[PDB]
Amino acid sequence: KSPEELKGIFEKYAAKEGDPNQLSKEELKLLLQTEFPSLLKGPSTLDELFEELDKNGDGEVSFEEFQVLVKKISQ
Ligand SMILES: [Mg+2]
């Protein structure tokens, strides 16, 4: 999906609670589940990518961190 499309999806789920410009891990699990179900198959690398991308260690990722995450978990 295009970054424009990706931004709309990101915003939709981040809006659920907390900072509207951040996605927590549970918000990201719901988003993947309904938006990219195929990315939640087989052994997951979600926690490893999440741990590495949440640089500030606040349990949340920004839009650019989410983009990299979708990119990487895909290959
Ligand atoms: Mg963070």
Query: Could you tell me the distance, in angstroms and rounded to a whole number, from the CA of residue 56 to the centre of ligand 1?
Result: 5
CATH of domain 1-75: 1.10.238.10
Residue 50 CA to ligand 1 center (angstroms) comes to 9
Binding site, by residue number, is 22, 27, 54, 56, 58, 60, 65
Q: Reported resolution in A?
A: 1.5
Give the Å distance between the CA of 62 and the centre of ligand 1: 7
Which residues participate in the annotated binding site for Ca(2+)? Answer: 22, 27, 54, 56, 58, 60, 65
Contacts of 62-70 with C-beta under 8 Å, sequence gap 24+, read: 62/21, 62/22, 63/6, 63/7, 63/10, 63/21, 66/6, 66/10, 66/23, 66/28, 67/3, 67/6, 69/28, 70/6, 70/36, 70/39
